[PDB]
Design a protein around this ligand. Structure first.
Ligand SMILES: Cc1ccncc1NC(=O)CC1CC2(CC2)C1
Ligand SMILES: Cc1ccncc1NC(=O)CC1CC2(CC2)C1
Lengths: 304, 304
């Protein structure tokens, strides 16, 4: 009973968090095996920020300029390299707390947990969705750069995001663990357009199924729709078009509840057209799109 | 930038989670030092559930009937005692991962993080508020009993909640770590009334301050109110009466934003009376009461 915006347990990720300082800037690094991953903007200074020449800035840096501290102990840096927008600092000690891990590039609409950190120390954990426009609506302050996003399949941690930047609009931008930015963003202090965002339709439908599973069913109606009719409504309301692939991923929830995917789409159509009429669904007065169908199945079945 | 329902990092609590089996029932236990804490209903069977005689049920149990497993290794139980609604199983090994900890009994309206577990394994973490009526609106399934709620001050974990039960209404009830239920609840399979719940006024005000700090200010008006006028509105809308103690706790947020507490109360008064008019505050279409003024200060300043 109950449905919460649940994050993965952050323990395996806390054991990887380190502090990285270069010059006067301190941020977070991720220590996996004998490598420390961090945003390359750690090598910048305030004059360099509007358009840094990272190649030139890194050339003036030697292994001993990168101060990496894992809690109270200092790590010895024996190599440094820039891969896209990340720095990889080779250290002489493999992290004893390295969990089984993978680097993955998530798709827009997928969810993940963020372990927000400052000075290499964890402050909190929350569940995020990578927006269709490749931004995240996180909670990050100066010093949070290098905080990571991840998913956990039993004992394996799939790292998918590293935080780099806060856009002038207050939304966040970052990279995969190979330093490739999600979206069109560049690591510069420049105004950058995030694309038009949309609501993650498949996730809203998954959350409507979660609502039915947990007793909230007032929104179920006597109607049905087609993918084409629904997609006309989705276009008008800035929702992602629903495809047969999305319908297929909703199969387990459709089977559990006995509510056909197109019947659920018709409920969503009526909610989009008429609103909630002052009512709530799973304690929310808006349509929630931060739960994937996989998240709903996992939470609704207690996968550990 | 940004404001999220952030939970504490669960690492220190994951290292304490164990599985406890007695007879055919398996649930979660909390291993701190050489003691394993778990709900006493682990000793029950389906016939006993409508009104268990815990004293009699425990008498038929010996140390060897309590199977405690910490991951893959089995713990040796050398003592057992019932303290209120919890069982304390003395084990021969002190938990090497025991963090600095305290047992605390939280007040209604206070928040905490829950590490949901099944079979001694963590599945997820979320931030909760203890409702004014002493229930929690969690996400728990069969097997989650023994999952705990906590807060973290730097390196010290204050355990405040242990999950015991799901009421017929889908809301949750549990105890402090001395086995005292929060609320009038008893550990029996009986329909139990939770009191009339109210909205945590001080927390909504704290969240309105967080909204202003993060750029959402459309709700700020040209009005002010008094504690008495505001409390008349709070009574009508099932909000907790605001006291000078609540106003005092809002002092830091009032000082940061320069918005007097009574001016913020007037904004809340207008939102209660007129609604949101289809608008949102920090991505919510309802008034959020799960952030204390302490949570807002912590998140808004990046305390680790
Ligand atoms: C201030 C803040 C808040 C939240 N997250 C991140 C930040 N930090 C930044 O965005 C500054 C970085 C971006 C850069 C040009 C390469 C320097
Ligand atoms: C089924 C479930 C779901 C979520 N949380 C908890 C549960 N479990 C229970 O409430 C069963 C317990 C309560 C008892 C009388 C003493 C047996």
């Amino acid at each position: 009973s109950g449905f919460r915006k649940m994050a993965f347990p952050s323990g395996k990720v806390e054991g990887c968090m380190v502090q990285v300082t270069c010059g006067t800037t301190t941020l977070n690094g991720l220590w996996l095996d004998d490598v420390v991953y961090c945003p390359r903007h750690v090598i910048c200074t305030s004059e360099d920020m509007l358009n840094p020449n990272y190649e030139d800035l890194l050339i003036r840096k030697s292994n001993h300029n990168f101060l990496v501290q894992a809690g109270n102990v200092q790590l010895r840096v024996i190599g440094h390299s820039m891969q896209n927008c990340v720095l990889k600092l080779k250290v002489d000690t493999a992290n004893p707390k390295t969990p089984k891990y993978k680097f993955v590039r998530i798709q827009p609409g997928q969810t993940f947990s963020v372990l927000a950190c400052y000075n290499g120390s964890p402050s909190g954990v929350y569940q995020c969705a990578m927006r269709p426009n490749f931004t995240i609506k996180g909670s990050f302050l100066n010093g949070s750069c290098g905080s990571v996003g991840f998913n956990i399949d039993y004992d394996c941690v799939s790292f998918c995001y590293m935080h780099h930047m806060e856009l002038p609009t207050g939304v966040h931008a970052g990279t995969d663990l190979e330093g490739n930015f999600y979206g069109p963003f560049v690591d510069r202090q420049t105004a950058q357009a995030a694309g038009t965002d949309t609501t993650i339709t498949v996730n809203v439908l998954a959350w409507l199924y979660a609502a039915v599973i947990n007793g909230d069913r007032w929104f179920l109606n006597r109607f049905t729709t087609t993918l084409n009719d629904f997609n006309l409504v989705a276009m008008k309301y800035n929702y992602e078009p629903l495809t047969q692939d999305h319908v297929d991923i909703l199969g387990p929830l459709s089977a559990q509840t006995g509510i056909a995917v197109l019947d659920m789409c018709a409920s969503l159509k009526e909610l989009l057209q008429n609103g909630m009429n002052g009512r709530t669904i799973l304690g929310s007065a808006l349509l929630e799109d931060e739960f994937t169908p996989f998240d709903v199945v996992r939470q609704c079945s207690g996968v550990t």
